[PDB]
Design a protein around this nucleic acid. Sequence first.
RNA 1: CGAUGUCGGCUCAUCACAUCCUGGGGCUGAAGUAGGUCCCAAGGGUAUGGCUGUUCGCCAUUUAAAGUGGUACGCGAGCUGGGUUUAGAACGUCGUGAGACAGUUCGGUCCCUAUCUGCCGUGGGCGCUGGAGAACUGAGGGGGGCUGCUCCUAGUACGAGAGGACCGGAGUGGACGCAUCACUGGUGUUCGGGUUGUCAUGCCAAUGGCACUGCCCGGUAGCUAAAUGCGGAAGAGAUAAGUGCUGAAAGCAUCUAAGCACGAAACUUGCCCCGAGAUGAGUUCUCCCUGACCCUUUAAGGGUCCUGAAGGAACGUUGAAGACGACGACGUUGAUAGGCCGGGUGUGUAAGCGCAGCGAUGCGUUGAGCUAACCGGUACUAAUGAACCGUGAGGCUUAACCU
RNA 2: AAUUCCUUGUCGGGUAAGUUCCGACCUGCACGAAUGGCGUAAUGAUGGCCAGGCUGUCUCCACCCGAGACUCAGUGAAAU
RNA 3: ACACAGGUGGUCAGGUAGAGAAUACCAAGGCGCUUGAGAGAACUCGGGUGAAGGAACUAGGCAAAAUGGUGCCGUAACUUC
RNA 4: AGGACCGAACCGACUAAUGUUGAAAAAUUAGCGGAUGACUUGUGGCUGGGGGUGAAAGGCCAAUCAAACCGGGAGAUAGCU
Lengths: 118, 123, 209, 56, 114, 6
Amino acid sequence: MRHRKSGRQLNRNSSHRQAMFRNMAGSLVRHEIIKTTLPKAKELRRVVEPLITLAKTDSVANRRLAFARTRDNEIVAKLFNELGPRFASRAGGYTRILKCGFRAGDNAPMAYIELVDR
Amino acid sequence: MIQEQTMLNVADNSGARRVMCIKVLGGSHRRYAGVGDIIKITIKEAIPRGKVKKGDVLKAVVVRTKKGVRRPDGSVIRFDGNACVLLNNNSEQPIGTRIFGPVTRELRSEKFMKIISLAPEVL
Amino acid sequence: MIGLVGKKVGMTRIFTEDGVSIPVTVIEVEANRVTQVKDLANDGYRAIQVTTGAKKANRVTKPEAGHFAKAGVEAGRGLWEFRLAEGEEFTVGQSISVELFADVKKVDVTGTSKGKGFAGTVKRWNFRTQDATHGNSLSHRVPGSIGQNQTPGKVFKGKKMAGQMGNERVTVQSLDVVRVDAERNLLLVKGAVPGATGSDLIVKPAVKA
Amino acid sequence: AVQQNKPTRSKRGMRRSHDALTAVTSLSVDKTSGEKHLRHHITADGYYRGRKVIAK
Amino acid sequence: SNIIKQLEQEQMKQDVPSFRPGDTVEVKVWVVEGSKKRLQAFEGVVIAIRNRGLHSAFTVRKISNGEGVERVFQTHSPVVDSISVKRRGAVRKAKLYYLRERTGKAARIKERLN
Amino acid sequence: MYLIFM
RNA sequence: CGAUGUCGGCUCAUCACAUCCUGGGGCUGAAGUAGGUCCCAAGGGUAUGGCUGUUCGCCAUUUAAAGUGGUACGCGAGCUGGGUUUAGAACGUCGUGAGACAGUUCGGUCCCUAUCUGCCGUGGGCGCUGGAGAACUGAGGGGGGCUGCUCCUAGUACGAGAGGACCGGAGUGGACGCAUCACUGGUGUUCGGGUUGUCAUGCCAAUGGCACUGCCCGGUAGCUAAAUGCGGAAGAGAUAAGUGCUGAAAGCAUCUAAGCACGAAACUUGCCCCGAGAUGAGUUCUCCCUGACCCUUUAAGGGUCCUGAAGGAACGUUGAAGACGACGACGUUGAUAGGCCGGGUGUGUAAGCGCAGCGAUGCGUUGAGCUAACCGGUACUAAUGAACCGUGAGGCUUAACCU
RNA sequence: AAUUCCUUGUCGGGUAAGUUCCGACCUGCACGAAUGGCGUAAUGAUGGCCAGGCUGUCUCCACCCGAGACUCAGUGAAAU
RNA sequence: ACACAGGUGGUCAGGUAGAGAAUACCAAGGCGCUUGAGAGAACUCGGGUGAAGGAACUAGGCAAAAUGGUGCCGUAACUUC
RNA sequence: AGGACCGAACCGACUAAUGUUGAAAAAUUAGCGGAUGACUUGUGGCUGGGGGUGAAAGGCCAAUCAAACCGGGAGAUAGCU
Ligand SMILES: CC[C@H]1OC(=O)[C@H](C)[C@@H](O[C@H]2C[C@@](C)(OC)[C@@H](O)[C@H](C)O2)[C@H](C)[C@@H](O[C@@H]2O[C@H](C)C[C@H](N(C)C)[C@H]2O)[C@](C)(O)C[C@@H](C)C(=O)[C@H](C)[C@@H](O)[C@]1(C)O
Ligand SMILES: [Mg+2]
Ligand SMILES: [Mg+2]
Ligand SMILES: [Mg+2]
Ligand SMILES: [Mg+2]
Ligand SMILES: [Mg+2]
Ligand SMILES: [Mg+2]
Ligand SMILES: [Mg+2]
Ligand SMILES: [Mg+2]
Ligand SMILES: [Mg+2]
Ligand SMILES: [Mg+2]
Ligand SMILES: [Mg+2]
Ligand SMILES: [Mg+2]
Ligand SMILES: [Mg+2]
Ligand SMILES: [Mg+2]
Ligand SMILES: [Mg+2]
Ligand SMILES: [Mg+2]
Ligand SMILES: [Mg+2]
Ligand SMILES: [Mg+2]
Ligand SMILES: [Mg+2]
Ligand SMILES: [Mg+2]
Ligand SMILES: [Mg+2]
Ligand SMILES: [Mg+2]
Ligand SMILES: [Mg+2]
Ligand SMILES: [Mg+2]
Ligand SMILES: [Mg+2]
Ligand SMILES: [Mg+2]
Ligand SMILES: [Mg+2]
Ligand SMILES: [Mg+2]
Ligand SMILES: [Mg+2]
Ligand SMILES: [Mg+2]
Ligand SMILES: [Mg+2]
Ligand SMILES: [Mg+2]
Ligand SMILES: [Mg+2]
Ligand SMILES: [Mg+2]
Ligand SMILES: [Mg+2]
Ligand SMILES: [Mg+2]
Ligand SMILES: [Mg+2]
Ligand SMILES: [Mg+2]
Ligand SMILES: [Mg+2]
Ligand SMILES: [Mg+2]
Ligand SMILES: [Mg+2]
Ligand SMILES: [Mg+2]
């Protein structure tokens, strides 16, 4: 039974999932569009969208909180100086998932995920 | 939740210091004994000049449980250790003359009217 | 007596002034509009058919919307039937309120259980597990033996085995009606009724003495 | 455990009566490119629902 | 849960005082000794508070007659007549379950003053 | 050990 | 004998009645209470430990009772491997000896991915005669059926006393079963905090990785029992053993031959669940389709053009539903999921700055900061315009009506 | 008794209850003196019994984290 | 027999903590083990936690749980000292 | 000083689980014994089948041991299938 539960396990342990979505969040902020599988792009929205709601208010305490969840300063400097100002008048829904074909090597359903203004 | 092989402290002045439950009386395949339930015990430790000797087989009544009792408004009253009062095998009247520590209102009936009379505190 | 159709809202507690905890289940019994009345000369048996709630007008199909427009009632979310007793009569379109249970002391509530999926024999049939230690080889929660030898040489029908548990209609009988709240369409029964929050319940008065 | 008699070509083909693939019902057509694609998927030229979304 | 929350809030007490874990409190409950009624106190230390609305509870622990006794009260029950804080305590936690292995001079809680 | 019926 | 694994334990059972308890009766050397014995009855129920490899037995303490048997002395392609039975070694005994014991003693590898039947679940296909969406009926089948103690009647009936009821009624438990999460709790490696060693982000401060989640302390939702609601019935029909009424054959007698009435947890129902593949394929309600032409083998015939309805499927967002199918909700005329806003819950007074202190650290801002699965809202993102399947009024005979 | 069949010999201790354990008696089926007799401190992955602590061994299981089992794409056996 | 969780002699010997060539985390250096993507049923393997009880389990405390360091105090019968 | 003590390398193989068409024709994981000695190890050499060698188990002598393996007598013999 998994009644009323959230989060996908994605065939990893607890610390591999946290390290994968942290690298993958730094790849979507940096490039503004990446191509992943469809179950990973759906679980990415729960990671990368709270980072942009964090980055709408500028303070030193919030920058130290978005550094503890990204571990990169090239990403924190872009969230607060670029993505904060853009999404400052939008109430959620900063990403967009576009389904595409299947992967050649294992027939996985792939999908693009992009920040909503490009 | 007292069951068989459970070692209980003793809450009267009969002389016994630790007794072990050897039977839960009052039903077939019966498992547990809450507060106010007769058990059949054996004496494991005793002071030298008490009324009972180590090795005797007696009856008892459970007066405190670590599992605790529940009140009709949902409240719970727990204790830090299981305790009991030694009864006579046949008359089922308490052997001792004093009760130590608090007891509960689950003993308030005609069967155990002499235990909540000697009790220092009833919760 | 006929019953009503409701919805399990969830559990709460009712405090009485003598200090008692009563676990009640809240059932939102909206008005039950009668859709069709069955009789002996046309249907072989006497019953009424009620609907409750409301449905989206773009979701009702053409066969269903014609069945409601014959009665004049508005389209609810389902259709249930109730067998009439000797002396009860209802009319098409009449709405039945929760005041049917005003002086009823006990009710039977039937619903669809929670789904536990494919459950093994320890969860489903309360079997005993075997030893977790002492030499056991890959056989801790398995059923064990399922028959006898050459006689009969088969497993009997109705053998207790692992399979789908829950998600089935069960009836819980003789629940105390604690409080009927007619002005906001509530019914507080005493105890646990089957089903998850938001599921349909059928509340009939108690048939046992 | 293992069989006691060889299963036929009849029983083998009956088992494969549910192994049959089904085809995609129909393909959607984009409204500015006219390309066929899967429904709710982007086309091979990066168009989706009248808009070019993947400029690659 | 607009139905249920409206059912519970017409049963909640409007006069519950503010207390924290560590506070020494005195709870007065209604006792029925057959027919006659009474009020006995329960002076002890609040070691756990459960905040859930109508289903709010709190746990008191006192050493009575040499035997430690815990009691879990329902906050909005009409058995509990009055709650009264006797002393404010200073702890760094929300559940003082470590006070079950301590006794005597080790179970002393500092006073808060703020 | 009771290895073969005997 | 080109192999049908042995005793015992565990797990799961199923049947018989020669009945252990509960149920109904006759006789009693049956006053009452408690018994003895026999007849009917298989619905349900029918112990925990000490010793021993033990089944068995003895013992301790319960219980209403701790039934007797069959099922390859039920059950190793379900588990164990303790035992009287491989190879090592020793004692006692027998043998000159190799060795042997019917005696004891310490140690000693238990394989198999299920084709068929069977059973537990769950779907696809076709049928049910135009197609479709619902709601039913109920042939049939399954589940359930246990019982203690206290009080009243009543210290009455009975009895010299001691003692002590039948019938009827109320309350409260044990075991079992079904549901559930409001409460008490468990879990909660997806929430918060404390702390050890070390590496890193240039450094301080603040953080992150790793060491079983590093080790711990709490804890939301969900799941759950030890938690808390409910159940077993009453009633009816036909009976068993039994008890009779009227009554002859047999002027009487006689429960029986004609006739009539009682009679049990067994049977048929009543309670709950599945159920029209019930091919005997049922019933009711609603909805949809009202064009043209040609030919042969002229018949429930085949083809062309137009047409595509009700509804379904498919795809997407998903669910207290789920192995996959299936089932439920929703798809812009939209709260289906994610996000966001507000709250709640949990943790326990963040970071930065200021002050006190030689310093660890304390204090103020501050019940602060963070907060998963929760509650109430909000179209910001994703749920597309289509396309696909499904047709065009539905055979013959006979009857009754309208014509 | 690593030896005793009768035998769970009988008495005492331990336990609520002990066919095993310890101490004895001698009726040694069928001990016995270098195929050594009786003791013996230390030692033993040695045999038997008891107690304290500890615990999912168990009453009686519940929840969680991972690797399979299930679904999809690729390759693709075996006993019989 | 395999691109096989096995076997195979010698030499070198960094930092922090540590008695240490143990162990944890790192440097130089080398790798992520030649099928993947989902789902989050029974059951099996490997682990974490558990209310009350605490060997009642069993042939048997099998297996798990627990103990665990340095300094100082203190330590019985028996003894071949 | 010690066939002394605790304990890594090294040597072993007491218990349990897994594996049993295995990753492996004897291993893996978690614990376990010895660990300056009757220790352990590399390279070469010697002992040959009714023979060797054996701190003795009928152990070992190339996955074979109450008499190795290869070739021959040889198409031994088979009242048995
Ligand atoms: C790893 C897998 C091996 O299996 C085992 O180890 C199991 C556990 C044996 O039991 C073990 C353990 C045990 C107690 O038997 C269970 C013992 O009796 C036997 C000798 O060895 C089996 C089953 C034996 O059968 C039994 O042999 C008996 C002589 C007669 C019996 N009879 C009923 C047909 C029969 O089933 C026997 C001989 O090994 C089967 C033959 C074919 C083999 O030699 C095969 C090749 C085995 O090596 C094996 C299959 O590879
Ligand atoms: Mg995988
Ligand atoms: Mg095995
Ligand atoms: Mg196992
Ligand atoms: Mg047959
Ligand atoms: Mg054969
Ligand atoms: Mg047998
Ligand atoms: Mg078998
Ligand atoms: Mg031998
Ligand atoms: Mg023999
Ligand atoms: Mg096996
Ligand atoms: Mg029936
Ligand atoms: Mg809790
Ligand atoms: Mg935790
Ligand atoms: Mg620092
Ligand atoms: Mg690192
Ligand atoms: Mg880690
Ligand atoms: Mg014992
Ligand atoms: Mg002796
Ligand atoms: Mg001798
Ligand atoms: Mg001799
Ligand atoms: Mg001599
Ligand atoms: Mg001699
Ligand atoms: Mg495949
Ligand atoms: Mg490889
Ligand atoms: Mg290798
Ligand atoms: Mg080496
Ligand atoms: Mg190392
Ligand atoms: Mg799992
Ligand atoms: Mg526990
Ligand atoms: Mg505990
Ligand atoms: Mg035992
Ligand atoms: Mg036992
Ligand atoms: Mg062990
Ligand atoms: Mg040494
Ligand atoms: Mg060796
Ligand atoms: Mg090892
Ligand atoms: Mg050593
Ligand atoms: Mg030999
Ligand atoms: Mg060899
Ligand atoms: Mg020879
Ligand atoms: Mg010759
Ligand atoms: Mg020949």
